[PDB]
Amino acid sequence: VERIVSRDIARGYERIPIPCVNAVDSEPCPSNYKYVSQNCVTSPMNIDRNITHLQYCVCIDDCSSSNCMCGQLSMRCWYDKDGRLLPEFNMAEPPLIFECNHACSCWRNCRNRVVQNGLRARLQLYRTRDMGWGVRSLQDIPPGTFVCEYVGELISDSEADVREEDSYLFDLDNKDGEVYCIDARFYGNVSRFINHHCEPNLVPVRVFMAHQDLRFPRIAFFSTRLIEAGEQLGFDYGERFWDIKGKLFSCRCGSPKCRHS
Amino acid sequence: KQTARKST
Ligand SMILES: Nc1ncnc2c1ncn2[C@@H]1O[C@H](CSCC[C@H](N)C(=O)O)[C@@H](O)[C@H]1O
Ligand SMILES: [Zn+2]
Ligand SMILES: [Zn+2]
Ligand SMILES: [Zn+2]
Ligand SMILES: [Zn+2]
């Protein structure tokens, strides 16, 4: 039967609690990592935070017009009045999103600000039957909604390559060269617990907010369809995960269209 | 790579 093993895994760092429950076994709330709500570093990363390097808009409205320069950078502003991605948004090949920033002329409540407002969906960490811990939604999530950010320790591609515990690494760029990675193993938020699914209800999108250093996008998960209350969250970890892990275990997502079973 | 990486 269900036991609530934590009131809030985030210790009050998010806008709402993220409880943890276990209806499967005797395990308490996972505690072998440090919950952080924003990315951190160990070794320095030298993100370009020169305020004069920001591209910004000069909008006199709420940034919902054709003329918003931040929208232009994003191709167009993809957010509707409710903060959801427009039906036209390419989920198969997402564009980079540039949200408004502190250099823009607009107000803090303009249209082009969603990820920077943080996690607001009611989520729950729970014990799955056969994939360890997972994350579910406690309420219906309409399509195109921002759900959570992949947060953790920002490291180099080189450093990521010597991290023995590799289950929580997320590459920020797929190219060769100077590339960075978020490791959610030691420091991470709720997204570290999101399991892989071959027909996923989340898609990761690269987003820029307070800085526009292209080496360091932030990773935001948006829903790809209506997620019903109770449903487990999942995204496609991608081939660079399964190329390594597929030699060790098979995918248990359960999709008829599973590509890693 | 030597380690598993999630990616877009
Ligand atoms: N679709 C899937 N099939 C089998 N194992 C999965 C899976 N998705 C995630 N996992 C497991 O979870 C790891 C990613 S970390 C995700 C959270 C994890 N379930 C935990 O309890 O900490 C993978 O290496 C694998 O061990
Ligand atoms: Zn604007
Ligand atoms: Zn702007
Ligand atoms: Zn704006
Ligand atoms: Zn699968």
Numbering used by the authors:
A (entry chain A): 975 to 1235
B (entry chain P): 2 to 9
Question: Which sentences did the original study use to describe this structure?
Answer:
SET domain methyltransferases deposit methyl marks on specific histone tail lysine residues and play a major role in epigenetic regulation of gene transcription. HKMTs catalyze the transfer of a methyl group from the co-factor S-adenosyl-L-methionine (SAM) to a substrate lysine and, with the exception of DOT1L, are all organized around a canonical SET domain. Methylation of H3K9 in humans relies mostly on members of the Suv39 family, namely EHMT1/GLP, EHMT2/G9a, SUV39H1, SUV39H2, SETDB1 and SETDB2, as well as then non-Suv39 enzymes PRDM2 and ASH1L. Here we report the high-resolution crystal structures of the methyltransferase domains of GLP, G9a, SUV39H2 and PRDM2, and propose a structural mechanism for substrate recognition.
The H3K9 peptide lies in a groove formed by the I-SET and Post-SET domains, as previously observed in other HKMTs (for review), and makes extensive contact with the enzyme through both backbone and side-chain interactions. Superimposition of our six new H3K9 methyltransferase structures shows that in all cases the first β-strand is in a conformation which would preserve the pair of backbone hydrogen-bonds observed between Lys-9 substrate and strand-1 of I-SET in the GLP-peptide complex. Our structures single-out residue R-1 of H3 (the methylated lysine is used as reference position 0 for peptide residue numbering throughout the text) as the major contributor to the interaction after the substrate lysine itself, with four direct hydrogen-bonds between the arginine guanidinium group and GLP. Intriguingly, our structures of GLP in complex with mono- or di-methylated susbtrate peptides reveal that residue H3K4 is making 2 hydrogen-bonds with the D1131 and D1145 side-chains of the I-SET domain, which suggests that H3K4 methylation may lower binding affinity, and reduce H3K9 methylation efficiency. We tested this hypothesis, and observed a mild decrease of 43% in affinity of GLP for a H3K9 peptide trimethylated at lysine 4, and similar reduction in enzymatic efficiency, while Kcat was unaffected. Several aromatic residues line the GLP channel occupied by the substrate lysine leading to the catalytic site and contribute to methylation state specificity as previously noted for several other HKMTs. Second, the hydroxyl group of GLP's Y1124 (Y1067 in G9a) hydrogen-bonds to the methyl-accepting nitrogen, thereby inhibiting an orientation of the dimethyl-amine that would favor transfer of a methyl from SAM, as was previously shown for SETD7 (for review). Unlike I-SET, Post-SET is absent from the PRDM2 structure, which lacks co-crystallized SAM or SAH. It is partially folded in the structures of G9a and SUV39H2 in complex with SAH and SAM respectively, and fully ordered in the ternary complexes of GLP with SAH and H3K9 peptide. (3) A more rigid conformation in which the I-SET domain closes onto the substrate peptide.
